[PDB]
Amino acid sequence: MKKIEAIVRAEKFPEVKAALEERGFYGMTVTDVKGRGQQGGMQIQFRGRTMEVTLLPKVKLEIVVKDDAVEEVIGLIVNSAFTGSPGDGKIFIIPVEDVVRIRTGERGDDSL
Amino acid sequence: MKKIEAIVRAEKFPEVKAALEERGFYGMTVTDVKGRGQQGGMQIQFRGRTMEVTLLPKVKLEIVVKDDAVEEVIGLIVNSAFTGSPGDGKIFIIPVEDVVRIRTGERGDDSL
Amino acid sequence: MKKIEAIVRAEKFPEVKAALEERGFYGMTVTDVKGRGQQGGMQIQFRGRTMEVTLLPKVKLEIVVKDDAVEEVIGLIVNSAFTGSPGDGKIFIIPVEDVVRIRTGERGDDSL
Ligand SMILES: [Cl-]
Ligand SMILES: [Cl-]
Ligand SMILES: [Cl-]
């Protein structure tokens, strides 16, 4: 089992939740976070000390799937979350040693 | 050392914080998150496109313990967080390679 | 690649963001969390049942760097986040198996 952790745009989150859910992927946990920004104008040049980075609101989705779903889940996120502009987010694959389902006490891939 | 990550009900969080603390487990970090919902009525059937999942407020607790506390911590969470109804949450065991205590610069199991 | 996860003081966060950024470290994701408190007075002794722990607002920063930056990143956080008083926070080193940059589809250390 791997923990998929993707940080995406807020405008693109409904598109990410809709891409995953349509493939039976439920169980995502969502956190409102702040990450690297920028934006447009007409003006002005966003400076800062130190070191000019404006922390802006983004969406963090965490989903724990089986080893064989990982690539399918990755593709679904990149396509739905993509815009082509800098700041579309990142996806991190984090090892998960074991999962425990509270209601049933189930463990392993069955628990998901 | 393992990172325990459990997503529970908000009504059950004081019961989880109270179960852990009574066993000397301090150090938990808590995040307000959203996860899979449902709820009751009398009515109505909660639909949605795509794919009918209502993201609802939950509690995320993260606790970094030594390898030998893991099972004790797991049991304490499942019992306090359990209701028997769908949506009691999940517990993920995530490997933690090393911990650093900022105030002391301590590392390893002593740092916790 | 490792995921650095540090839970620090809110007063010290601008000092942490400024220490990292000055070394080209961008990409941090920030979450408002709650952790172990205490505080001063003149009074009063903060009790509680169970077991007297007051969950207080803190800052969580997550940064995914290459294996060789890990120690440099660790030092920068401890120094900027340190005060000497109990509650300066902790830094956890979590293995990250793979990173995916959404805008480019890049993977590995290049993606960061
Ligand atoms: Cl993780
Ligand atoms: Cl984790
Ligand atoms: Cl982690």
Domain of A88, CATH number, reads: 3.30.70.120
Structure tokens belonging to residue B72? 């004790």
* Cα B5 to ligand 3 centre (Å): 9
Which residues does B42 contact at the CB level (< 8 Å), separation at least 6? none
* Cα A93 to ligand 1 centre (Å): 8
CB pairs under 8 A between A and C: 81
Question: How remote is the C-alpha of A20 from its chain's centroid?
Answer: 11
Confirm if A6 and A77 have CB atoms less than 8 A apart.
Answer: yes
Confirm if B51 and A22 have CB atoms less than 8 A apart.
Answer: yes
CB pairs under 8 A between A and B: 81
| Nearest residue of chain A to residue C111 (CA atoms) | A90
Query: Nominal resolution in Å?
Result: 2.3
Q: What is the largest CA-CA distance in chain B?
A: 56
Question: How remote is the C-alpha of C1 from its chain's centroid?
Answer: 17
Method: X-ray
CA gap B4, B12 in Å, rounded: 17
> In chain B, how many domains are there?
1
CB contact under 8 A, B94 and A95: yes
Question: How remote is the C-alpha of C17 from its chain's centroid?
Answer: 10
Nearest by CB to B53, from A21, A100, A103: name it: A21
* Cα C95 to ligand 2 centre (Å): 9
Nearest by CB to A26, from B8, B53, B74: name it: B53
Question: How remote is the C-alpha of B93 from its chain's centroid?
Answer: 11
CA gap A90, C51 in Å, rounded: 39
Does the beta carbon of C66 lie under 8 angstroms from any beta carbon of chain A?
no
- A14-to-A17, B7, B49 alpha-carbon distances in Å: 5, 21, 10
Q: Is C24 annotated as a binding residue?
A: no
Question: How remote is the C-alpha of A77 from its chain's centroid?
Answer: 7
CA gap B64, B61 in Å, rounded: 10
CA gap C66, C68 in Å, rounded: 6
Please give the residue range of the domain that contains residue B6: 1-112
Radius of gyration of chain B (CA): 17
- Cα-Cα end-to-end distance for chain C: 9
Confirm if A42 and A50 have CB atoms less than 8 A apart.
Answer: no
CA gap A107, B8 in Å, rounded: 17
Confirm if B63 and C63 have CB atoms less than 8 A apart.
Answer: no
Q: How many residues does chain B have?
A: 112
Question: SS3 of B14, please?
Answer: helix
Q: Is C73 annotated as a binding residue?
A: no
Confirm if B8 and B88 have CB atoms less than 8 A apart.
Answer: yes
Question: SS3 of A13, please?
Answer: helix
| Nearest residue of chain B to residue A95 (CA atoms) | B94
Confirm if C73 and C24 have CB atoms less than 8 A apart.
Answer: no
| Nearest residue of chain A to residue B32 (CA atoms) | A31
Q: What percentage of chain A's residues is helix, strand, coil (to nearest 5)?
A: 20, 35, 45
Confirm if A19 and A76 have CB atoms less than 8 A apart.
Answer: yes
Check residue A11 and report its DSSP letter. T
Q: Which of C71, C68, C76, C63 is nearest to C22 (CA)?
A: C76
Give, in degrees to the nearest 5, the angle at Cα C31 between C27 and C37: 135
Confirm if C7 and C59 have CB atoms less than 8 A apart.
Answer: yes
